[PDB]
Coordinates of all heavy atoms in Angstrom, one line a residue:
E5 N -16.6 -11.7 -4.6 CA -16.1 -12.4 -5.8 C -14.9 -11.7 -6.3 O -14.1 -12.3 -7.1 CB -17.2 -12.7 -6.8 CG -18.4 -13.7 -6.4 CD -19.1 -14.4 -7.5 OE1 -18.8 -14.0 -8.7 OE2 -19.9 -15.3 -7.3
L6 N -14.8 -10.4 -6.0 CA -13.6 -9.6 -6.5 C -12.3 -10.0 -5.9 O -11.3 -9.6 -6.4 CB -13.9 -8.1 -6.3 CG -15.1 -7.6 -7.1 CD1 -15.3 -6.1 -6.7 CD2 -14.9 -7.7 -8.6
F7 N -12.4 -10.8 -4.8 CA -11.2 -11.1 -4.0 C -10.8 -12.6 -4.0 O -9.9 -13.0 -3.2 CB -11.4 -10.6 -2.5 CG -11.5 -9.1 -2.5 CD1 -12.7 -8.4 -2.6 CD2 -10.3 -8.4 -2.3 CE1 -12.7 -7.0 -2.6 CE2 -10.3 -7.0 -2.2 CZ -11.5 -6.3 -2.4
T8 N -11.4 -13.4 -4.9 CA -11.0 -14.8 -4.9 C -9.7 -15.1 -5.4 O -9.1 -16.3 -5.2 CB -12.1 -15.6 -5.6 OG1 -12.2 -15.1 -6.9 CG2 -13.5 -15.5 -4.9
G9 N -9.0 -14.2 -6.1 CA -7.7 -14.4 -6.6 C -6.7 -13.3 -6.1 O -7.1 -12.6 -5.1
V10 N -5.6 -13.2 -6.6 CA -4.5 -12.2 -6.3 C -4.9 -10.9 -6.9 O -5.2 -10.9 -8.1 CB -3.2 -12.7 -6.7 CG1 -2.1 -11.6 -6.5 CG2 -2.7 -14.0 -6.0
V11 N -4.9 -9.9 -6.1 CA -5.3 -8.5 -6.6 C -4.2 -7.6 -6.4 O -3.6 -7.5 -5.3 CB -6.6 -8.1 -5.8 CG1 -7.0 -6.6 -6.1 CG2 -7.8 -9.0 -6.0
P12 N -3.8 -6.8 -7.4 CA -2.7 -5.8 -7.2 C -3.3 -4.6 -6.3 O -4.4 -4.2 -6.4 CB -2.4 -5.3 -8.6 CG -3.7 -5.5 -9.4 CD -4.4 -6.7 -8.7
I13 N -2.4 -4.1 -5.5 CA -2.6 -3.0 -4.6 C -1.7 -1.8 -4.8 O -0.5 -2.0 -5.0 CB -2.5 -3.5 -3.1 CG1 -3.4 -4.7 -2.8 CG2 -2.7 -2.4 -2.1 CD1 -3.0 -5.4 -1.5
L14 N -2.3 -0.6 -4.7 CA -1.5 0.6 -4.6 C -1.9 1.4 -3.4 O -3.1 1.5 -3.0 CB -1.8 1.5 -5.8 CG -1.5 0.8 -7.2 CD1 -2.1 1.7 -8.3 CD2 0.0 0.6 -7.4
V15 N -0.9 2.0 -2.7 CA -1.1 2.8 -1.5 C -0.5 4.1 -1.8 O 0.7 4.2 -2.2 CB -0.6 2.1 -0.2 CG1 -0.7 3.0 1.0 CG2 -1.2 0.8 0.0
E16 N -1.2 5.2 -1.5 CA -0.6 6.6 -1.7 C -1.0 7.3 -0.4 O -2.2 7.4 0.0 CB -1.1 7.3 -3.0 CG -0.6 6.5 -4.2 CD 0.9 6.7 -4.5 OE1 1.5 7.6 -3.9 OE2 1.5 5.8 -5.2
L17 N 0.0 7.9 0.3 CA -0.2 8.7 1.5 C 0.5 10.1 1.4 O 1.6 10.1 1.0 CB 0.3 7.9 2.7 CG 0.2 8.7 4.1 CD1 0.0 7.7 5.2 CD2 1.5 9.5 4.4
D18 N -0.2 11.1 1.8 CA 0.4 12.4 2.1 C 0.2 12.7 3.6 O -0.9 12.4 4.1 CB -0.2 13.5 1.2 CG 0.0 13.3 -0.3 OD1 1.1 13.1 -0.7 OD2 -1.0 13.3 -1.0
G19 N 1.3 13.1 4.2 CA 1.3 13.3 5.6 C 1.9 14.7 6.0 O 2.7 15.2 5.3
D20 N 1.5 15.1 7.2 CA 2.0 16.3 7.9 C 2.0 16.0 9.4 O 0.9 15.9 9.9 CB 1.2 17.6 7.6 CG 1.7 18.8 8.4 OD1 2.3 18.6 9.4 OD2 1.4 19.9 7.9
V21 N 3.2 15.7 9.9 CA 3.3 15.4 11.4 C 4.2 16.6 12.0 O 5.4 16.7 11.7 CB 4.0 14.1 11.6 CG1 4.2 13.8 13.1 CG2 3.1 13.0 11.1
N22 N 3.6 17.4 12.8 CA 4.3 18.5 13.5 C 4.9 19.4 12.4 O 6.0 19.9 12.6 CB 5.2 18.1 14.5 CG 4.7 17.8 15.9 OD1 3.6 17.2 16.0 ND2 5.4 18.2 16.9
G23 N 4.3 19.6 11.2 CA 4.9 20.4 10.2 C 5.9 19.7 9.3 O 6.3 20.3 8.3
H24 N 6.2 18.5 9.6 CA 7.0 17.7 8.7 C 6.1 17.1 7.6 O 5.2 16.2 7.9 CB 7.8 16.6 9.4 CG 8.8 17.0 10.4 ND1 10.1 17.2 10.1 CD2 8.7 17.3 11.8 CE1 10.7 17.6 11.2 NE2 9.9 17.6 12.2
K25 N 6.3 17.5 6.4 CA 5.5 17.0 5.3 C 6.2 15.9 4.6 O 7.5 15.9 4.6 CB 5.2 18.2 4.4 CG 4.3 19.3 5.1 CD 3.6 20.2 4.2 CE 2.9 21.3 4.8 NZ 1.6 21.0 5.5
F26 N 5.4 14.9 4.1 CA 6.0 13.8 3.5 C 5.0 13.0 2.7 O 3.8 13.2 2.9 CB 6.7 12.8 4.5 CG 5.7 12.3 5.6 CD1 5.2 11.0 5.4 CD2 5.4 13.0 6.7 CE1 4.3 10.5 6.4 CE2 4.5 12.5 7.6 CZ 4.0 11.2 7.5
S27 N 5.4 12.2 1.7 CA 4.6 11.3 1.0 C 5.2 9.9 0.9 O 6.4 9.8 0.9 CB 4.4 11.9 -0.5 OG 3.8 13.2 -0.4
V28 N 4.3 9.0 0.8 CA 4.7 7.6 0.6 C 3.9 6.9 -0.5 O 2.6 7.1 -0.6 CB 4.5 6.8 1.9 CG1 4.8 5.3 1.7 CG2 5.4 7.3 3.0
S29 N 4.6 6.1 -1.4 CA 3.9 5.3 -2.4 C 4.2 3.8 -2.1 O 5.4 3.5 -1.8 CB 4.4 5.7 -3.8 OG 4.1 7.0 -4.1
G30 N 3.2 3.0 -2.2 CA 3.4 1.6 -2.0 C 2.7 0.8 -3.1 O 1.7 1.2 -3.7
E31 N 3.3 -0.4 -3.4 CA 2.8 -1.3 -4.4 C 2.9 -2.8 -3.8 O 3.9 -3.1 -3.0 CB 3.7 -1.4 -5.6 CG 3.8 0.0 -6.3 CD 4.6 0.0 -7.6 OE1 4.9 -1.1 -8.1 OE2 5.0 1.1 -8.1
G32 N 2.0 -3.6 -4.2 CA 2.1 -5.0 -4.0 C 0.8 -5.7 -4.3 O 0.2 -5.4 -5.3
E33 N 0.5 -6.7 -3.5 CA -0.7 -7.5 -3.9 C -1.2 -8.2 -2.7 O -0.5 -8.5 -1.7 CB -0.4 -8.5 -5.0 CG 0.6 -9.6 -4.6 CD 1.0 -10.5 -5.7 OE1 1.2 -10.0 -6.8 OE2 1.3 -11.7 -5.4
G34 N -2.5 -8.5 -2.8 CA -3.2 -9.2 -1.7 C -3.9 -10.5 -2.2 O -4.4 -10.5 -3.4
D35 N -4.0 -11.4 -1.3 CA -4.6 -12.8 -1.6 C -5.5 -13.1 -0.5 O -5.1 -13.8 0.5 CB -3.4 -13.8 -1.9 CG -3.8 -15.1 -2.7 OD1 -5.0 -15.3 -2.9 OD2 -2.9 -15.8 -3.0
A36 N -6.8 -12.6 -0.4 CA -7.7 -12.7 0.7 C -8.0 -14.1 1.0 O -8.3 -14.4 2.2 CB -9.0 -11.9 0.5
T37 N -7.9 -15.0 0.0 CA -8.0 -16.5 0.3 C -7.2 -17.0 1.4 O -7.5 -17.9 2.2 CB -7.8 -17.2 -1.0 OG1 -8.7 -16.8 -2.0 CG2 -7.9 -18.7 -0.9
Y38 N -6.0 -16.4 1.5 CA -5.0 -16.7 2.5 C -4.7 -15.6 3.6 O -3.8 -15.6 4.3 CB -3.7 -17.1 1.8 CG -4.0 -18.1 0.7 CD1 -4.1 -17.8 -0.6 CD2 -4.3 -19.5 1.0 CE1 -4.4 -18.6 -1.7 CE2 -4.6 -20.4 0.0 CZ -4.7 -20.0 -1.3 OH -5.0 -20.9 -2.3
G39 N -5.6 -14.5 3.6 CA -5.5 -13.4 4.4 C -4.2 -12.6 4.2 O -3.7 -12.0 5.2
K40 N -3.6 -12.7 3.0 CA -2.2 -12.4 2.8 C -2.0 -11.0 2.1 O -2.7 -10.7 1.1 CB -1.6 -13.5 2.0 CG -0.1 -13.4 1.6 CD 0.4 -14.6 0.9 CE 1.8 -14.6 0.6 NZ 2.3 -15.8 0.0
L41 N -1.1 -10.2 2.6 CA -0.6 -9.0 2.0 C 0.9 -9.0 1.9 O 1.6 -9.4 2.9 CB -1.0 -7.8 2.9 CG -2.5 -7.5 2.9 CD1 -2.9 -6.7 4.1 CD2 -3.0 -6.9 1.6
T42 N 1.4 -8.5 0.8 CA 2.8 -8.3 0.4 C 2.9 -7.0 -0.2 O 2.4 -6.8 -1.3 CB 3.3 -9.4 -0.5 OG1 2.9 -10.7 0.0 CG2 4.8 -9.4 -0.7
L43 N 3.6 -6.0 0.5 CA 3.8 -4.7 -0.2 C 5.2 -4.2 0.1 O 5.9 -4.5 1.0 CB 2.8 -3.6 0.4 CG 1.3 -3.9 0.0 CD1 0.7 -4.6 1.2 CD2 0.7 -2.6 -0.5
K44 N 5.6 -3.2 -0.7 CA 6.8 -2.4 -0.5 C 6.4 -0.9 -0.6 O 5.8 -0.5 -1.6 CB 7.9 -2.7 -1.6 CG 9.1 -1.9 -1.5 CD 10.2 -2.2 -2.5 CE 11.4 -1.2 -2.5 NZ 12.3 -1.5 -3.6
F45 N 6.8 -0.1 0.4 CA 6.5 1.3 0.5 C 7.8 2.1 0.3 O 8.9 1.7 0.9 CB 6.0 1.6 1.9 CG 4.7 0.8 2.2 CD1 4.7 -0.4 2.8 CD2 3.5 1.3 1.7 CE1 3.6 -1.1 3.0 CE2 2.3 0.6 1.9 CZ 2.4 -0.6 2.6
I46 N 7.7 3.3 -0.3 CA 8.9 4.1 -0.5 C 8.5 5.5 -0.1 O 7.5 6.1 -0.6 CB 9.3 4.0 -2.0 CG1 9.7 2.6 -2.4 CG2 10.5 4.9 -2.2 CD1 9.9 2.4 -3.8
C47 N 9.3 6.2 0.7 CA 9.1 7.6 1.0 C 9.7 8.4 -0.1 O 10.9 8.4 -0.4 CB 9.8 8.0 2.3 SG 9.5 9.8 2.7
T48 N 8.8 9.1 -0.9 CA 9.2 9.8 -2.1 C 9.7 11.2 -1.8 O 10.2 11.8 -2.8 CB 8.0 9.8 -3.1 OG1 7.0 10.5 -2.5 CG2 7.6 8.4 -3.5
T49 N 9.6 11.7 -0.6 CA 10.1 13.0 -0.3 C 11.4 13.1 0.4 O 11.9 14.2 0.7 CB 9.0 13.7 0.6 OG1 8.6 12.8 1.6 CG2 7.8 14.1 -0.3

C-alpha cells in the first residue's frame, strides 16, 4: 500500500574500485503502478 502512488527516492553510494574511492548521490522518484523509475545521479567526488 506504500507504493500505490509516486514515492521520492534517494540513493547514496560509497565505492572503492582498485583503490579509486568515490561517492555518488542520486535523487528522483518511483511509480510502481507503472514499473517506473526516474533518477539523476551525481558523482560528488
Side-chain angles (χ1 to χ4, degrees):
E5 293 206 348
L6 297 172
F7 292 90
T8 58
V10 173
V11 175
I13 302 168
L14 301 168
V15 179
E16 296 288 342
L17 177 147
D18 300 302
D20 173 335
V21 174
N22 280 37
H24 297 267
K25 296 198 185 284
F26 61 99
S27 301
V28 174
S29 298
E31 303 182 14
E33 66 187 32
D35 200 354
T37 300
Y38 311 101
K40 181 177 185 173
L41 291 162
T42 310
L43 295 99
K44 177 179 172 187
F45 302 91
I46 302 170
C47 180
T48 62
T49 51

